[PDB]
Ligand binder design. Structure first.
Ligand SMILES: Cc1nnc(Cl)c2ccccc12
Length: 207
């Protein structure tokens, strides 16, 4: 298990997300689904020139999995996945410019729901989750588990668990007062409202 520090701007963005009073928390789901959709667009496009890129899985879909016992809501996709370099450096590096712009916009009237317009919507997961675990597998790399309870640090380890073939699972360990996002009717309401026109089948699992 390796422990890394988030870059200062990213740590600041996560603190803001965690500390700002903002009741419209549901937007986190639209943001994660949109991220899944972009990851699925990526593998689908690369597979046009290299069909073997789908040898790790032909299905392209998004599954939403609530688990009341564990208090988690998991967003699963069979998209392109993330390499170790993406997890420890590249994604955070790219999010720096969007972070600065977003934070500037916030001081100038914008609100949290616009986070996705700045390409840093993944961090909105912290509106609802006290901890986020990400299991991911990219064709060119091993399966990894990234995890963070914010606080300026995250971990990365090679994952020994059930192999996923290819894709990403975002496991949201929900805050005590955010369990409504485990309810079937609440999830459906949010997906219908914000994610109506996504081009991959989204399956809402039940318990
Ligand atoms: C920026 C970003 N987007 N999506 C996912 Cl699943 C991430 C996981 C770890 C770190 C950054 C992420």
């Amino acid at each position: 298990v390796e422990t890394f520090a988030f870059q200062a701007e990213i740590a600041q963005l996560m603190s803001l997300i965690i500390n700002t009073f903002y009741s419209n928390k549901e937007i986190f789901l639209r943001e994660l689904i949109s991220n899944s959709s972009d990851a699925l667009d990526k593998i689908r496009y690369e597979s046009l020139t290299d069909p073997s890129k789908l040898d790790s899985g032909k299905e392209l879909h998004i599954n939403l999995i609530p688990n009341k016992q564990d208090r988690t809501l998991t967003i699963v996709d069979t998209g392109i996945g993330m390499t170790k370099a993406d997890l420890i450096n590249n994604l955070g590096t790219i999010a720096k410019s969007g972070t600065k712009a977003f934070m500037e916009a916030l001081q100038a009237g914008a609100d949290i729901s616009m986070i996705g317009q700045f390409g840093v919507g993944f961090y909105s997961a912290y509106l609802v989750a006290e901890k986020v675990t990400v299991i991911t597998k990219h064709n060119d790399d091993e399966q990894y588990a990234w995890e963070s309870s914010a606080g300026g640090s995250f971990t990365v380890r090679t994952d020994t668990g059930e192999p996923m073939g290819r894709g990403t699972k975002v496991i949201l360990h929900l805050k005590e007062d955010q369990t409504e996002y485990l309810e079937e009717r609440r999830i459906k309401e949010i997906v219908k409202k914000h994610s109506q026109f996504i081009g991959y089948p989204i399956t809402l699992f039940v318990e």
